[PDB]
C-alpha cells in the first residue's frame, strides 16, 4: 500500500477519505473537533489498509464515534518517532466512545498512552498494555467510564481475561515469539517482523517491521548504499536528493538538517 504524510483532520469527515489508500502514515494522525457527526456517519466508514503510524495517534472531541474497531481494524504498530508530549496514543474527551477496539494494535514502539475523560469509555481494564509497551509506568488512563460490564476463550494475564470488545480478544503470542508476532496456530513470525505476519518465519510476509523496511522485506539495518529514513524505511541517494530539491546525509541517515557542528558539502554533512 501507499505511504501518506501526517494528517490533521478536523470539523468535517470530508478530508478523512484522504487515508483511503494508506498502509503507513509517515507522521501523526490527529482527528478532532467534529461536533456535527453522528453514529450513522461512522457505521460504514473503514480504513482497513492502515497498518502503521510512525509518530502518534490523537483523537479529541469526535462526536458520534463509539468505537475504533471499524475505522482502524488493522492498525498494528504506532512507532512513536515523534510524540505528543511523550504520548504515542491520545484519546481525550471522546464523548461517545464506548471502547477503543484497536484489536490489531500489537506494539507501541516508543512513548506512552494517555486516555482521559471519556465518559462512556469501557474495555480499558481488559487491555494488557504491558504486551504493547515496554513501560506502562508513564501511561495516564483516568476519568473514564471504567461499573462497565466488560464482557469478553481470551488470554489472561496479571489474573484477568483480555479483550478489546465483546467480539475481539487481545492477541497474545508465546513468549519465544517476543515482539515478532505469530500466526493463529501460534507459530512465530520472522525475527524481523513486528506484531503480526501472514506466514511464519518469512521476512516478506510481515504486517510491519521491527527495524527497517526495504523492497517488500523487513531488514535489520539499511545496507549501503541505502539510507535510514524516518527511522523505519530505507531509501536511496536519489530519493533524499529529490526531497532536498523541494534534507541531508549524516551517519547513514537521510535527515532534515545537519546536526550541531556540521554543514552540508553540496548532500553529506561534514564537520
Amino acid at each position: 500500500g501507499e505511504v501518506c504524510p501526517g494528517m490533521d483532520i478536523r470539523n468535517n469527515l470530508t478530508r478523512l477519505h484522504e487515508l483511503e489508500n494508506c498502509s503507513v502514515i509517515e507522521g501523526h494522525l490527529q482527528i478532532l473537533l467534529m461536533f456535527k457527526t453522528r453514529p450513522e456517519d461512522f457505521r460504514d466508514l473503514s480504513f482497513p489498509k492502515l497498518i502503521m503510524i510512525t509518530d502518534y495517534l490523537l483523537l479529541f472531541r469526535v462526536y458520534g464515534l463509539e468505537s475504533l474497531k471499524d475505522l482502524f481494524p488493522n492498525l498494528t504498530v504506532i512507532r512513536g518517532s515523534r510524540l505528543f508530549f511523550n504520548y504515542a496514543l491520545v484519546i481525550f474527551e471522546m464523548v461517545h466512545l464506548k471502547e477503543l477496539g484497536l484489536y490489531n494494535l500489537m506494539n507501541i514502539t516508543r512513548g506512552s498512552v494517555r486516555i482521559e475523560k471519556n465518559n462512556e469509555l469501557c474495555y480499558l481494564a481488559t487491555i494488557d498494555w504491558s504486551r504493547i509497551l515496554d513501560s506502562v509506568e508513564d501511561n495516564h488512563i483516568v476519568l473514564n467510564k471504567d461499573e462497565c460490564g466488560d464482557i469478553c476463550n481470551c488470554p489472561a494475564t496479571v489474573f484477568v481475561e483480555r479483550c478489546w470488545t465483546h467480539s475481539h480478544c487481545q492477541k497474545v503470542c508465546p513468549t519465544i515469539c517476543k515482539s515478532h508476532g505469530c500466526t493463529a496456530e501460534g507459530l512465530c513470525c520472522h525475527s524481523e517482523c513486528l506484531g503480526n505476519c501472514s506466514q511464519p518465519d518469512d521476512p516478506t510476509k510481515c504486517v510491519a517491521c521491527r527495524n527497517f523496511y526495504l523492497d517488500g522485506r523487513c531488514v535489520e539495518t539499511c545496507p549501503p548504499p541505502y539510507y535510514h529514513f524516518q527511522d523505519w524505511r530505507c531509501v536511496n541517494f536519489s530519493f533524499c536528493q529529490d526531497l532536498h530539491h523541494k534534507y541531508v546525509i549524516h551517519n547513514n541517515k537521510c535527515i532534515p538538517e545537519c546536526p550541531s557542528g556540521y554543514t552540508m558539502n553540496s548532500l553529506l554533512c561534514t564537520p
Binding site: 478532532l32 473537533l33 479529541f60 505528543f84 508530549f85
Partner: peptide
C-alpha cells in the same frame, strides 16, 4: 507542567 502543556494545547484549539 506536562498536564498544563497537555490541556493548554486542547484549549488553543478552542
Amino acid at each position: 507542567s506536562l498536564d498544563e502543556s497537555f490541556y493548554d494545547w486542547f484549549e488553543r484549539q478552542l
